Specification:
The structure is a homopentamer.
Chain A lengths: L1 E16 L4 E13 L11 E3 L3 H7 L7 E3 L11 E5 L4 E13 L11 E10 L7 E9 L11 E3 L4 E8 L12 E13 L2 H18 L9 H23 L9 H25 L18 H13 L1
Parallel strand pairs in A: 1-8
Antiparallel strand pairs in A: 1-2, 2-6, 3-5, 4-7, 5-6, 7-11, 9-11, 10-11
Helix pairs in contact in A: 2-3, 2-4, 3-4
The structure holds 1-palmitoyl-2-oleoyl-sn-glycero-3-phosphocholine (5 copies).
PDB class: structural protein
Keywords: elic, ion channel, pLGIC, structural protein
Assembly: pentameric
């Protein structure tokens, strides 16, 4: 088996798409193996560029096709090259921009914690013909500053395993294990924008909703509650335009439904305080002691729901 | 006729587009047939990569072109390879990302139930020259968890038939049947997001609409009803931005029109209760017993409309 | 001149873009002509695939380039093939996905009636070297059901004409007529969604606008009219987001302006009924008999504008 | 120097992008020059198609590369051909779809007046080796009707000049002038949609804003003014979604700010009329004679700002 | 080492994408080095076009591959050419359209100040085989007028350095320094649109918010404050649709939160002025002297926050 040493340079990770669960990684890949000795011009190593590589492969040079398992489509390969040494050492360096995929969980949306996975595997050669020796990952370009949307936490985590394919038992007996490289990069979201523009004014709106029981009349309370309901609907749409599409409810979504429930509970208490009459003229004040109890009860419900 | 055995691996199904009725499938395809015996280097099977295949076809190798019937455009073929055995067995493995199409019914939108169809057919050879032996479909990567937008229900369903083309009777008599493979994958939508963010607050708004007959005056009722109408219009737009474009009304759309009808019926009852006067000063209370009857009548109408 | 017989199969028509006046057609094209006799392997006809065709053209095979006149850009040609008969008959079958263009009129938007045109012409050969014999169009896949956005009315309409180009008189005297094939497919829009979600609640809002003259006071009337004006602006935006961009006003647009005019006329009548005072205290009731006349006058104006 | 005669056929101009200042032109280009005499099959001129041209250039045929100077990227070249005459006359016809760029001024947005420029230049040959003889432009397909978004005013305007490049003085002395063709097409926007849907209801809203001084009380005036402010904000967003993104304020934008200023001036006059009290109880009517003066003053300010 | 002289012509810089931190540069690149003398046809220099260059490289011509380090993907190379002199001087001219990337800071959004960076480096040759002699940058096409979105301040700034790669110490000892060219272009945003459409009406809305303490009653104050809160939410959404997506709060965002805080502080002062009662009937005027103090305090807070 040929021992291939891979090195992956990550230049930038961006373009996270929550609906399709993809992201875009840009960088280089450097594979290195040892073949037969050869005589190059002089003694210095020989360099083959982008179109010239196909000319050398047609003449019988062995260059394996390394596949990204979780890429969507095909990577946009830029420049690529081969460096052939007279010793017999071959180095294949290429640049990619792919759209990779993973199992991404956005259920805690502003306070999220994802990891970005690249999986690499030979397209055709099992580990009796090509096994990966070692893998170094250089993520020195991606940073941790407040400008960046995602905080990359620590260096990348690497792994080399042997994936077994059970459909090859009919045609390739005893040789169906393929050598796979996995690269994981942990990342934490920047929650500052979503905490200052979305979480806080919704809390202010919900807190200002509770001050309709200071109104003296009853029709004033209902008209004010319906104005607050329109405010909560407008805020729900204001958040739901500027946020990533998801098939489940995030934290912000949980708070919008809490706002709707607060408005409807306020309307129900106003009606029940109005309806407590002997025949239609007897006023009420005992139920309206919830100017300091209903906000606390709703806050306790929310604190239970957070835990 | 040459017997070709196909195997389709489905990696992910995503990107469902309701207006154009498309979806995107990513995966592999493995065709396998038996030709003439040959002498390879050694006795081990020979492998041909991506660009090298065109070199072997020019020298006379028979590789059929398998077409996806319902693909839109042309698939984005990534890596592809041929494995040639000295026995005479040929295996063609290729990776695709296509945008397929089907007859999709979204008339029950959140509680939907679709099926994803892939149809495969030789581009040029009828079943007197190429017929499909058997087909295995491996959908082991696509899952059922709550993160996933679509719940894939059970294994895929396969079929091999003979499609007859009547336009070939002029030039190819008695040979116009083509062998076609059909693959169906049933899927159910994740209705949790649409049931918590769209169905429930609309029900709360419509339920809170009925509490305008507790208001004492008449001008208060009209101003409150118009505020509720603006709330329903804002909610209609809030849903209709965040939802898939369709040429027909879904469930959520049916509920928005029910909300408009509830507002207009409330306005009509307020006017008819106001207008019941002898000359302009006689008040009314008999018609305003619909504080507990009109909500029940509207709920009965909605329950009839669901069934 | 060589007689070429074309057959066009339409698979689906979709993706209508109103601003750029384009649409997307997917399907096949089958051209068939007769050349010189040849000796094929055996007596059976020979098949040439996608890349192999370029090899046969370099050796001197005559394959004309058929151009779509109204395509925008270049079609995304998928698989293509040549079938060469020993008789001398040649059949060229290819698959396309193009973005075609036409002169489209959306001035009656929900109740629209368009036709989709494909124009085909040889790129280089005038009718003294290549004329189109006959053309069959098979639109059997596109349907009429309620799921489909567009109702295709009847079979396609075909035509073969001779287009004359006057700029070729300087370099090609007496030979400047080119043979052109035109294919027209009539289609009617699905108006159900736009009639239930856009036309009807706007009518309900405009009808509920007229019930502000039942209010007793004057400040109540002005505040209520301004609330209705905000409702009409919100509805105008709700429609104008979910509709195709156009450089002219459609029916729905005509109704939005009718709603604005109804609100402004209501405000003008409220002011003129208020202003009819001797010095500032004399009330009015004679002008306020338009609770049953102004709606009828506006409906008559709208009925005149429809006709 | 070789004299090349160009003819440009414009098929359609569409897809104007205001932010990037681009537009899309589709059409043909026909260059024609005279070379060496040759012997073709027979005496009739010979035709070379799309892929065959590269075969003739490798054998030594001189085909210059004509570049569009202001194209963004590279044009989507469709079919192309060469017609070789035995006289020695060569005609190169090709079809393009490019995304061209210009210095576009949208500061008078609905009543705009732009011109579309195509600049053509040889990529490599200066005017001592290739100079453009004459240029005809055929814009017969683009029209003036009310369906069209842009009204093309008159025939195209053409020009042939000699552009001098000062960076070539180091390596190519006395030969750095290149022959450039410029084509200008004047166009006027269709202002009907923007005048009926955007200019007029904003004028109605601003005119209805002035009728808050007919209200008797003071709190009614403030609540009504704030409702009008919300109406103007909603209208500002309704226009600003459905309009082209620009880095400066257009006419419609000028009118939105005029509406905001009218609302704020109305609020200031209501406050100043309220505040004119001896101690807090003295009413006012002298300042409230601006029910017929403040609208006229604002209209005079707007008429000054238009001029 | 071969001395290569680069010249970069910038045609336009556009398409700035704030989320992915990219921009698009269009222009030319002219590299020039000196090789071996050769015999061309005649004595005039020879020109090689777009497809012909690959033919000359296969025969052994040395053309280095110059890479853009910060490009995303691969540039859309249009026309390219080689000019070969009999002296031995080689000139490689090519046209690119790339999507470059940089570390962009939009934290002061309308009053921004960015710089656009292009980095150029040989793909394979270290500075013992290829070092960059000098670099001229011609930005004569990009301007400073008010039509342009970005004001380019002064000429471009150039630099030539030696980047050292530490991963090459294992296979290429003592030769791992690569010659890199950096080009920086400073640019200032056009703040006029954002200052007239976004900053000023928000200031008018916030200033008009302070005039709710002129209202006499208490329920009027609360209803008016909630109407103002809905106005601020609608304005927040109106700005946040028409602005670039960012992971942090800009100036406009800071002002929206200031508006929310002003509304909530106004509500708190109205409640605290209402609540100052002995048992529920004692009115208040001492706290309501903040009709001229609370606006000044909020303005002082904002002026502190600006500094
Ligand atoms: C026997 C004594 C009983 C106690 C009564 C004492 C009264 C004190 C009551 C005080 C009510 C306190 C208000 C807090 C309600 C918040 C609800 C909430 O956030 O959940 C929201 C829905 O909430 C709703 O649907 C609204 C329904 C609220 C009904 C309560 C009104 C009670 C008045 C009756 C008084 C009648 C008086 C009688 C006079 C005749 C959802 O929360 P979420 O987690 O954000 O959603 C995410 C869900 N996923 C996505 C995770 C799946
Ligand atoms: C002889 C006795 C008669 C009984 C009267 C007794 C009163 C009790 C009345 C009570 C009214 C009950 C309110 C429920 C109305 C819901 C309607 C609804 O959802 O359908 C919606 C439209 O609805 C509308 O268009 C609004 C019109 C409503 C008119 C009713 C007012 C009656 C008042 C008169 C009282 C006058 C008093 C006289 C005083 C002088 C559409 O439903 P959808 O399915 O969601 O749409 C989908 C359609 N597709 C897409 C499937 C195609
Ligand atoms: C001498 C007797 C005169 C009769 C008066 C009797 C009163 C009865 C009056 C009754 C008024 C009836 C209301 C109907 C108005 C609808 C207008 C409409 O839709 O056209 C819309 C604009 O409409 C507007 O611009 C609004 C202006 C309306 C002005 C009328 C108020 C009259 C009050 C004065 C009373 C003063 C009382 C005096 C007290 C002192 C546009 O329609 P469209 O087709 O949808 O637009 C598409 C256009 N394209 C795209 C096709 C180009
Ligand atoms: C000594 C006598 C003085 C005369 C007072 C007589 C009163 C009569 C007053 C009558 C006021 C008339 C209202 C018309 C205002 C329109 C403003 C406008 O459109 O410009 C807009 C901004 O406008 C604003 O910013 C709003 C500020 C308006 C302030 C006026 C209130 C005066 C009340 C004080 C009375 C106090 C009474 C005292 C009681 C104690 C911008 O216009 P634009 O062109 O669309 O913007 C585009 C700009 N670019 C893009 C081109 C760059
Ligand atoms: C001991 C004496 C104490 C003094 C009281 C004297 C009263 C005078 C008070 C006057 C209040 C003055 C109003 C100005 C408030 C502006 C706040 C602001 O913009 O910051 C905003 C949040 O603001 C808020 O969250 C709203 C909270 C405001 C609370 C103040 C009400 C005090 C009433 C109590 C009176 C009770 C009376 C007692 C009767 C019983 C955020 O600002 P930003 O920079 O835009 O955000 C960007 C942040 N990043 C992105 C940079 C990170």
């Amino acid at each position: 088996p040929v021992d291939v040493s891979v090195s992956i340079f990550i230049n930038k990770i961006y373009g996270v798409n929550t609906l399709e669960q993809t992201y875009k990684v840009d960088g280089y890949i450097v594979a290195q193996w040892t073949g037969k000795p050869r005589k190059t011009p002089g003694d210095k190593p020989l360099i083959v560029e982008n179109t010239q590589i196909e000319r050398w492969i047609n003449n019988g040079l062995w260059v394996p096709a390394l596949e990204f398992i979780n890429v969507v489509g095909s990577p946009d390969t830029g420049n690529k090259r081969l460096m052939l040494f007279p010793d017999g050492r071959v180095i294949y360096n290429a640049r990619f921009l792919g759209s990779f995929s993973n199992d991404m969980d956005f259920r805690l949306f502003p306070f999220d914690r994802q990891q970005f996975v690249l999986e690499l595997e030979p397209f055709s050669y099992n580990n009796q013909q090509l096994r990966f020796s070692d893998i170094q990952v250089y993520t020195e370009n991606i940073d941790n500053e407040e400008i960046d949307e995602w905080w990359i936490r620590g260096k990348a985590s690497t792994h080399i395993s042997d994936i077994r394919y059970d459909h090859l038992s009919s045609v390739q007996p005893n040789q169906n294990e393929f050598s796979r490289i996995t690269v994981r990069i942990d990342a934490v979201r920047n929650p500052s924008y979503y905490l200052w523009s979305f979480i806080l004014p919704l809390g202010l709106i919900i807190a200002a909703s509770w001050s309709v029981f200071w109104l003296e009349s009853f029709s004033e309370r209902l008209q004010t509650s319906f104005t607050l309901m329109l405010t909560v609907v407008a805020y729900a749409f204001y958040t739901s335009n500027i946020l990533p599409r998801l098939p489940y409810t995030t934290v912000i979504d949980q708070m919008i439904i809490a706002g709707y429930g607060s408005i409807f509970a306020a309307i129900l208490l106003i009606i029940f305080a109005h309806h407590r009459q002997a025949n239609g003229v007897e006023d009420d004040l005992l139920i309206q002691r919830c100017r300091l109890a209903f906000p606390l009860g709703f806050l306790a419900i929310g604190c239970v729901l957070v835990i």
